[PDB]
Structure 1
C-alpha cells in the first residue's frame, strides 16, 4: 500500500510494503489513488513520493511473480504514465534502496532528491531480463550511455553520492531525505510553466559505435550462454533514438528475454534456493537449537574445509585430530587457503586473522564438551566411525547435534552406535567444502524434526544451499552421478574417447566432464565403491574401462596420471595413448565394432540418465521435490546455471520426447539402463513437467 499525507501544501505518498516496498498491486494502486487525491486537492501544489522503513523501493514484489496480480492494473507502466502526465510536479525522495522498478519509478518523476548511502541498481539482468519500464531509456539520459550500460549489463548497485554531477539527482543531501524533498517540492510547486521530464533529455555521446563495438565484444565474451546481457546493451543503445522508439525497442527486448529458457532457468534457480529449506513434515516455526560453538573431527581437506565455513561466518570451531602433525598440517593448509584468497583480493589479511583467531585445536575429546554441533569428517570406514561416535556419545553435551560427513556409509547405522539417534544427522559437504555451495542434509529414520530444522538454519548461516535427502546409497547427488558415469563408460565401449565425451558435455555447459571429474576426485575412490556392488546383493554392470584404468594405477591428478596426463602447474588435461589403446582393445575384446558417436547422443545419454534416476528419487521420496534435485546439480555438480538443472532441462526438452529417446536407447548397448522411470512416463502421458 501507500500512505498519503498532506503537509504544508505537499502531498507525500509513502510506499509501505515491507521489507523493501516491493511494487505489488496494492502498492501500485496506492500510488495512483494518492496521485488522484493530490491532483483533486487544490491546496496541494506539489507531490513527494518516498518509501517507509529501510527502502524507497527494491522493485518488483517477489511474492507476486507467479500471480495474475503481477500484471494487474495499474502496472508500473501505468503508474509511471500517471506520474509523467501529472500537472503538479512530482519529487521522488530516495534513500536506502532504489532498485529495479523502484529506480524506474523515480526516473518517471519530474525531480529526484537523494540522501547519501542509498543503493541504486537495475539488477534485472540477474534474472535474465532487462529493465522493462523505461529504465534503459531514461537512465542513459541522466547518466550517459556508458555509465548506464555498465549498471544495466552488470546489475551491480552504486551508492547515491557517486552520481554527483550527473542529472540523476537534482540535489544530493546528508541527513534525512524527506525534509529536504518537501522543501524542494515547495519551491517547484510555486513556479509554473510545465516541469521537466527525463524523456525530453538527450543521450549525448561523441562516438556511439566506437564504444558499442568494444562493449559488444567484452559483454559477449563475459556473457557466455546468457542472452540477457547483450540485449540489455542493445536496449541501452536505443536511448540514442527518440524516446518512444527506444521504449518500443526495450519492450521487445523484454518480451524476447521473457521467452528464453535462460531466464526460466535463472528464475528456477532463485526460487529453488528458497524452496530448498522446506521439508514436507517439518513446518516453519518448528524450533531450533542454538548453535554457538562447533567442533570438527578431522583436519583433512574436508574437515579443514567444513571448518572454514563456520569461521567465515564468525562461529568458533574446535578441530580434533589423532596426532599433533595431522593437526598442524591441517591448520597450515587452512591458513594457506585463506592467505591466497587474500592475494586474489577476496579478503584482507586482517579478515584472515580474525578468522584464524576463532579456530581451536585439541587432541582430546574432553575439549568438545560444550560444542552444540559436532561434525565427523574422518576416514570412510564403519569401524573408525564407530570409534568416533562412541567417544562423541560419551562427551558431547546433552542436546548437542552429532553429524557425519559420510558420503557412502549408512547414516542410520552410525546413529545406532549412540543412545541418542534422534540427534544424529548426515551433513554431507562437497569438496572443496569452503567453495562448493551444496550441503546435503541426510535425514536418518530417527533424526528428530527439531534437529533437521536446526541444521537447515545452520546451513543458511554458513551460506550453503542445504537440501534434505533421505537414506539410500549415494543420497541424491552421487546416486544420480553413478548413472551418468555408467553411460559415460558405456560410450567408451561403443566408440567414444574421454576427451570427446568431456568436450561435448562441457559445451552443453557442465563446468567439468565425467573423465576430468573422476580424475579430480580420484578414480580409485570409485574403484573401491563399485567393488562393493558386485559384493553386496546387486549385479548392475559397469563398463570395465574404469577398473582397467585403476589396475594401471592411473588414479588421476594425485598420481600425475588418470584418464589424461597432468603436468605440474599446467591446467590442461593431456589425452594419453596407453589409455586410449586400452579403451580400443576393450571394445575389440567385447565383440564391438566401434562407431562414430555424435555429441548430441553423448549429451542425451549422460543427461537423460540423470533425469531418469532423478525421477526414481522423487517417486521414492528421497528428495521431496524436483527443484531440490536441480539445486543439487547447480551447486554440487557444475550443471549449467543457464539450463537450470537436469529436471528443468528435461521439462524444457518436453517429457514426452525424453521418454521416446529413452525407448530408443533401450534397444542399443545395455538397453536395461534405459527403462523409463514410472514417474517420468506418467508425467509424460499427462503433459506435465517435474517442475511445472
Structure 2
C-alpha cells in the first residue's frame, strides 16, 4: 500500500555506511549487506561512529534517536536473503567493473521483480552497468557526497531505459531521507557537481604548476572574485590530496604534472590536507 519501505545497501564502506545510516535514521527498514561477518563487524563499527556524529551534528538525532536507528539496522552476508523483500537496493561496492558486473547479474536474479536498483558509482555510468541488471527500466544512479548528513545532495541519473515512474520514486525517496535531489535529465560522467568542480580545480592547479601564482593568491582571488567561502586549494585540502593525486595522475598532461607536484611537495611529506592537519594550508 506504499512505495519504498525496505532498503538494502550493498557495501558497508565509507559511502555505503553513510547511505545506510541516513536511510535508517529517516525511518526506512535497512539491511546492510557485505561479504562476510568480518566486514559486517566493521560495518557495525562504522554505524556506531555515525550514530555518535549524528547525535552531535544532525537535527533530531539527539536523545537516543540515532541509537534507535542504529539498533534497527539488519546485517546480512547472504545476498539472496539481503534483498528478498527489498523495494530498493543501493549499490556502493568498490569501483570495479568485474565486481559490479557479478553483483548486478546475481542481484537481478535474486531480487524480487519490484526491486529498484540504484548505483552510487563515481567512475561508472549506469549505461556501463545496465545490461547486467536484467531490469533496465528499474536501474539508475543515485549518487551521494561524502558526509551525506551535511553535504546532502543526491544526484539522480538514469539511462534512456529508465522508467520515469521509477526515477520519480527515487527522487521522492531521496527527499524522504533528507537529501536535496539533483535531477539530471541525461547521463553525464561526473554528474553535475564533479562536472563543475573538476574544471575549476584543474584551472587552479595549472596556474600553480605553471608558476603563475601561489596557492594563497589563487584562493584569495576566487574568494574575492566570486564571494565563495573557500578557494580551490582550500577545497583540495578538503577533498584530500591523496585523492586529488590519484585522480590527477590518470588525467591529462597538465593534470599529471600537478599529480607529480603534489606527490613531490605534499604526499611525500605526509601533508595530505584536512585529514593530517596540513595540506596546502596548515590546520
TM bucket normalised to smaller: 0.7 to 0.9
Q: Give distance in 1, aligned partners of 2:132 and 2:265.
A: 36
Q: Give distance in 1, aligned partners of 2:65 and 2:36.
A: 28
Write out aligned runs for 1:212-231 (5 A). none
Partner of 1:361: 75
- Alignment of 1:481 with 2:187, yes or no, is no
Shift of 1:458: 0.6
Q: Which one of the candidate residues 144, 153, 158 is aligned to 1:443?
A: 158
State TM-score, norm by structure 2: 0.86
Q: Give distance in 1, aligned partners of 2:8 and 2:205.
A: 40
- Alignment of 1:542 with 2:243, yes or no, is no
Partner of 1:495: 212
Between 1 and 2, higher relative CO (CA 8 Å, sep ≥ 6) is seen in 2
Secondary structure class of the residue paired with 1:486: helix
**Aligned length in residues:** 278
Q: Give distance in 1, aligned partners of 2:163 and 2:57.
A: 42
Q: Give distance in 2, aligned partners of 1:515 and 1:449.
A: 39
- Alignment of 1:297 with 2:10, yes or no, is yes
Q: Give distance in 1, aligned partners of 2:274 and 2:134.
A: 49
Contact map agreement 2:143 2:156 (CA 8 A) in 1: yes
Q: Which one of the candidate residues 205, 217, 241 is aligned to 1:523?
A: 241
Q: Give distance in 1, aligned partners of 2:2 and 2:200.
A: 38
Secondary structure class of the residue paired with 1:441: strand
Q: Deviations over 1:206-253 (max 9, x none)?
A: xxxxxxxxxxxxxxxxxxxxxxxxxxxxxxxxxxxxxxxxxxxxxxxx
Shift of 1:289: 7.3
Q: Give distance in 2, aligned partners of 1:468 and 1:344.
A: 27
Partner of 1:351: 65
Partner of 1:86: none
Q: Give distance in 1, aligned partners of 2:119 and 2:135.
A: 14
In 2 relative to 1, CA 560–333 (structure 1 residues): closer, same or farther, beyond 3 Å? farther
Partner of 1:638: none
In 2 relative to 1, CA 329–553 (structure 1 residues): closer, same or farther, beyond 3 Å? farther
Contact map agreement 1:407 1:428 (CA 8 A) in 2: yes
State TM-score, norm by structure 1: 0.37
Q: Deviations over 1:238-276 (max 9, x none)?
A: xxxxxxxxxxxxxxxxxxxxxxxxxxxxxxxxxxxxxxx
Q: Give distance in 1, aligned partners of 2:110 and 2:265.
A: 42
For structure 2, the residue ranges without an aligned partner over 5 or more in a row are none
Contact map agreement 1:527 1:547 (CA 8 A) in 2: yes
Contact map agreement 1:405 1:428 (CA 8 A) in 2: yes
Q: Give distance in 1, aligned partners of 2:54 and 2:191.
A: 32
In 2 relative to 1, CA 423–490 (structure 1 residues): closer, same or farther, beyond 3 Å? same
- Alignment of 1:419 with 2:127, yes or no, is no
Shift of 1:425: 0.4
In 2 relative to 1, CA 344–468 (structure 1 residues): closer, same or farther, beyond 3 Å? closer
Shift of 1:512: 3.4
Shift of 1:544: 4.4
- Alignment of 1:453 with 2:168, yes or no, is yes
Q: Which one of the candidate residues 17, 22, 30 is aligned to 1:309?
A: 22
Q: Give distance in 2, aligned partners of 1:310 and 1:472.
A: 26
Structure whose alpha-carbon radius of gyration is higher: 1
Shift of 1:386: 0.7
Partner of 1:552: 264
Secondary structure class of the residue paired with 1:349: coil
Secondary structure class of the residue paired with 1:403: strand
Write out aligned runs for 1:323-334 (5 A). 323-334=36-47
Contact map agreement 2:271 2:279 (CA 8 A) in 1: no
Q: Give distance in 2, aligned partners of 1:363 and 1:450.
A: 31
Shift of 1:435: 2.0
In 2 relative to 1, CA 344–296 (structure 1 residues): closer, same or farther, beyond 3 Å? closer
For structure 1, the residue ranges without an aligned partner over 5 or more in a row are 1-287, 535-540, 576-692
Q: Structure 1: which 4+ aligned runs deviate by more than 6 Å?
A: none
Partner of 2:282: 574
In 2 relative to 1, CA 547–438 (structure 1 residues): closer, same or farther, beyond 3 Å? same
Q: Deviations over 1:171-197 (max 9, x none)?
A: xxxxxxxxxxxxxxxxxxxxxxxxxxx
Partner of 2:51: 338
Q: Give distance in 2, aligned partners of 1:571 and 1:337.
A: 26
Q: Give distance in 2, aligned partners of 1:553 and 1:572.
A: 9
Shift of 1:565: 8.2
Shift of 1:529: 4.0
Shift of 1:410: 1.7
Shift of 1:459: 1.3
Secondary structure class of the residue paired with 1:542: helix
Shift of 1:374: 0.3
Q: Give distance in 2, aligned partners of 1:567 and 1:533.
A: 25
Q: Give distance in 1, aligned partners of 2:52 and 2:205.
A: 40
Partner of 2:271: 561
Secondary structure class of the residue paired with 1:466: strand
Shift of 1:554: 3.9
Contact map agreement 1:314 1:358 (CA 8 A) in 2: no
Contact map agreement 2:245 2:263 (CA 8 A) in 1: no
In 2 relative to 1, CA 525–294 (structure 1 residues): closer, same or farther, beyond 3 Å? same
Q: Give distance in 2, aligned partners of 1:566 and 1:426.
A: 29
Partner of 2:222: 505
Partner of 1:244: none
Secondary structure class of the residue paired with 1:380: coil
